[PDB]
Amino acid sequence: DGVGNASGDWHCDSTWMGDRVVTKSTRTWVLPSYNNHQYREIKSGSVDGSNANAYFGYSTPWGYFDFNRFHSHWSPRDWQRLINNYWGFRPRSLRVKIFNIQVK
Amino acid sequence: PAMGGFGLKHPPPMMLIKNTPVPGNITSFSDVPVSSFITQYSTGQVTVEMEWELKKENSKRWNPEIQYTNNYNDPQFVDFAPDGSGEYRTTRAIGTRYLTRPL
């Protein structure tokens, strides 16, 4: 759209609504240029005296987003407020969004 | 009230109750009131149902708060429960001020 116009806002909260809670977290990230824009065949032989440490694979120039830890969605006070009052929970939805990019 | 609670202009009415008297064997007139009564007592059930309104807490505190917890060490008995003889035990006075608020 435009240079001098923000792509999104900072939403970061929690909203308990009965049998559902919606959490929201925003964060700032930085992405390096890995492998100078190349693919490299990474490989290792047996290290530590264990051939189970010997692998063969590929490192790419990409980076990824990982939201697989609880403390990325819950504050310590909203966690506590959950484990003291409920008998269980399970995730229902997800909705990621990337914005306000800046290449330097 | 100095003892805590809610001060009310018109508090819950007082509910009184008594056993209507039943005279003993009277056998003659006397303008004097009868004083011989049959001894009686009454038993029954009472159900009281109150409704309360609550004020939800909406704090943006980050770290965890303090809660009232069942923190005993080397329990020889369970609190808030009857002991061997059947007598109800209560070793703590639970108050109400646990959550916090920025003044």
Side-chain angles (χ1 to χ4, degrees), chain B:
Chain B
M3 285 189 270
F6 308 76
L8 304 165
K9 172 180 173 56
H10 301 104
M14 263 210 297
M15 187 174 303
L16 289 297
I17 180 169
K18 80 160 186 177
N19 304 306
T20 293
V22 176
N25 178 188
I26 304 304
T27 64
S28 53
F29 178 78
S30 171
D31 198 46
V32 175
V34 311
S35 53
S36 182
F37 293 108
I38 295 175
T39 189
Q40 286 185 336
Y41 72 87
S42 52
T43 315
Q45 258 78 60
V46 58
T47 293
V48 39
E49 131 180 48
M50 291 204 60
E51 179 214 356
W52 308 77
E53 184 173 351
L54 307 160
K55 185 183 156 193
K56 298 204 169 185
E57 77 166 311
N58 59 139
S59 66
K60 297 304 275 278
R61 173 171 172 138
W62 178 260
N63 57 324
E65 297 187 310
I66 277 181
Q67 305 285 254
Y68 170 84
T69 188
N70 210 54
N71 53 296
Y72 300 100
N73 193 298
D74 177 59
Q76 298 296 290
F77 61 99
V78 174
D79 204 348
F80 294 98
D83 68 313
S85 63
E87 172 259 325
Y88 189 69
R89 302 290 298 290
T90 50
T91 302
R92 286 229 267 265
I94 311 177
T96 299
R97 246 90 90 148
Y98 283 95
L99 293 193
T100 50
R101 269 240 262 186
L103 248 190

Side-chain angles (χ1 to χ4, degrees), chain A residues 71 74-81 83, chain B residues 61-65:
Chain A
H71 69 194
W74 303 82
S75 42
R77 171 59 201 151
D78 274 334
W79 181 244
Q80 167 189 55
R81 167 177 182 185
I83 69 177
Chain B
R61 173 171 172 138
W62 178 260
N63 57 324
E65 297 187 310

Side-chain angles (χ1 to χ4, degrees), chain A residues 7-14 23-27 72 95 97 99-100, chain B residues 60:
Chain A
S7 318
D9 297 319
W10 182 284
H11 305 277
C12 204
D13 63 358
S14 300
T23 58
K24 298 202 188 189
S25 312
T26 302
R27 298 276 193 298
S72 294
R95 185 200 305 277
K97 170 163 180 287
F99 54 93
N100 293 347
Chain B
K60 297 304 275 278

Side-chain angles (χ1 to χ4, degrees), chain A residues 41-54:
Chain A
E41 159 188 294
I42 49 177
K43 62 186 184 174
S44 177
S46 68
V47 176
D48 282 2
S50 185
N51 63 52
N53 285 323

